[PDB]
Amino acid sequence: SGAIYVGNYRVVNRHLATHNDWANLVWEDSSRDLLVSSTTAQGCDTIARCDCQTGVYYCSSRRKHYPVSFSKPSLIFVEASEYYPARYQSHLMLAVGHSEPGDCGGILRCQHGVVGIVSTGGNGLVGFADVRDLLWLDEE
Ligand SMILES: O=C(NCCc1cocn1)N1CCc2ccccc21
Ligand SMILES: [Zn+2]
Structure with a gap:
């Protein structure tokens, strides 16, 4: 498991995305195994x-x-x-x-x-x- 927290984005493996990620979706691409969701707090x-x-x-x-x-x-x-x-x-x-x-x-x-x-x-x-x-x- 694990994610990248940059700005108001959370970058995770698409295959490990949660329901909250899919409900706050910014972008996803199955061929890359990536999904990005929006966050309330800013990342480092x-x-x-x-x-x-x-x-x-x-x-x-x-x-x-x-x-x-x-x-x-x-x-x-x-x-x-x-x-x-x-x-x-x-x-x-x-x-x-x-x-x-x-x-x-x-x-x-x-x-x-x-x-x-x-x-x-x-x-x-x-x-x-x-x-x-x-x-x-x-x-x-
Ligand atoms: O199961 C996966 N990845 C699943 C995600 C995936 C991407 O392309 C296809 N499936 N991996 C990642 C590390 C590892 C070590 C030994 C055997 C398998 C695996
Ligand atoms: Zn470099």
């Missing part, structure tokens, strides 16, 4: 605006933050899980890093701020959903 996270390929992510199944090298956001075939059929997921970045289902939502960050959240993984893979192209998270 800042979004990175960059092309970094190194950063650190939080792994809840190890209670640890790990430094990783990750690929640029791309369209990658991901295997069936409880939440999506084997399909192509867009804006996804891969790294070698330990992963399990309850980790979705952990933040990946670089020197500039939050880069994305954990979404896919398996066999020493972990795939993040990028948010650096969503410039509107910084305003309104």
Whole structure:
């Protein structure tokens, strides 16, 4: 589990969104596994605006933050899980890093701020959903 809290937005994995998220929906995209809902309180996270390929992510199944090298956001075939059929997921970045289902939502960050959240993984893979192209998270 986990979310990004930037401005009056909450960014979560679409497959983990709650009824309150769907009832206060700003934007969602199944191909990216992302959903954004509105919040009453302002958040403290800042979004990175960059092309970094190194950063650190939080792994809840190890209670640890790990430094990783990750690929640029791309369209990658991901295997069936409880939440999506084997399909192509867009804006996804891969790294070698330990992963399990309850980790979705952990933040990946670089020197500039939050880069994305954990979404896919398996066999020493972990795939993040990028948010650096969503410039509107910084305003309104
Ligand atoms: O179950 C999921 N993610 C579900 C969301 C998803 C995105 O694309 C398809 N399903 N993951 C995330 C971490 C992990 C480690 C080992 C095995 C699976 C998984
Ligand atoms: Zn960066």
